[model samples]
Target: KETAAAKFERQHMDSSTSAASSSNYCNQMMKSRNLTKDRCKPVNTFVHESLADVQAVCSQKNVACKNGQTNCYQSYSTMSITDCRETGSSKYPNCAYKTTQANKHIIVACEGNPYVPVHFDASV
Candidate 1:
């Protein structure tokens, strides 16, 4: 079975690629990355940071996860990220997304043996 940490890396992490410059970035990536399956994801984010930098959040100050868990950590520094939002005209099997980039502090849930990010809780 795919672990939650692995799943987060697949769906949200994109360290190899730099910050997206084009407006259609999310429209293309959301489909290519398989985030748009049966329907659009509504809202999702991609962090533009190294895997190690993201994982290091586990050692940062603790915060409450969206689900009210105590495993969430907020990034000490604002990170480069892109927010993908589903457009109103988007339809199933052909999801359309609006891409917006920003520098924001992100919150993520960490777990496992070494304590790595497992879920993208939110961005503030």
Candidate 2:
């Protein structure tokens, strides 16, 4: 079974394909990962950095968590990532995504119980 940390890992973490070598990257990763399941996730961001780096952001406690929330941290260092969004023609069980890889600082919403990232908030 997947733990909460693992759930987030599968959702937001990916050190594998650092760049979208081709346009087809998301359809496969998004599907293989969990975003393209029974329902389209609408959008998602995969940090190309390792779990250790992302995890360290929360530990380092460098920045704010959007709107002054506690326990969440935003990284000061920019990370390589890809943002994926579903296409209008896409439907449930057969999802399609348009992916863009870029470099930016990431804001992550953290779950303190395990100090693991739970959501890929946004890029800055």
Candidate 3:
């Protein structure tokens, strides 16, 4: 089984390209990262930053997680990211996505002994 930290990276981190270019980024990335395996991930976000930079979010200001957990933190600086959202017609195996690029404060959930990101809550 993949660790929460690992899954978080696969689903949210993308240092290469550092930004969205192709309008098809979501379609390719959602599939390439194995997010569209059994079902389509309704929404996802990819931070255009290095793994270390993203991991550092765990130590930022404490915040409430989407699930209301106390383990979430918000980045002190805004980060570049590409948000992938599914269209109404999207289906499994051929999941389609709409790409949205933005620079905003990233909220992430942290856990474990090393205290790393386990989930991306949202950006604001």
Candidate 4:
């Protein structure tokens, strides 16, 4: 089994398309919709250092809040994400992967206040 740090590093080095860029670089970088190669969410989410909490959430049988069952995904207030850095910054020195790579990467986002899972086509 991989340690959380190892897993996090593996996910970052193995799957990342590029090293992080500064906020200025990101804003100035040209956006496109044709880039290829990407990372998937939920999958990315699993790479986070906070796997213990995530594991508890995903391992639960009730992923949705229905009938008397709690929605594991929703029950948890805070989330550990792969896109946002551990400190939740858009800058470097953090392991958060970005969509601004030579390849197109995608991330899962929650829609509306209820946090419904949705696919974000980050090609651009």
Clashing pairs in 3: none
List where candidate 2 sits over 4 angstroms from the true fold: 62-68
lDDT of 3 by residue, 1-124 (tens): 9998899989888999779998899999999999999999899999999899988989889999988899999999999999999998797778999999999999999999898999889899
The order of the candidates by TM-score, greatest first, is 3, 1, 2, 4
**Candidate 4 or 1, higher TM-score:** 1
Stretches > 4 Å off in candidate 4: 1-49, 59-61, 64-75, 84-124
Prediction 3 global C-alpha lDDT: 0.92
Clashes of each: 0, 0, 0, 1
Candidate 1 lowest-lDDT run of ten? 31-40
TM-score of 2: 0.87
The best candidate by lDDT is 3
Error of 3 at 12 (Å): 0.7
For model 4, what is the alpha-carbon lDDT of residue 93?
A: 25
**Stretches of candidate 1 exceeding 4 Å from the true structure:** none
Model 2: per-residue Cα lDDT over 7-46, one tens digit each: 8889888887677777878788899886776789888887
Better of 1 and 3 by lDDT: 3
Report the error of model 4 at residue 7, Å. Answer: 8.0
Return the TM-score for candidate 1, rounded to 2 decimals. 0.95
C-alpha TM-score for every candidate: 0.95, 0.87, 0.96, 0.24
The better candidate by TM-score, 1 or 3, is 3
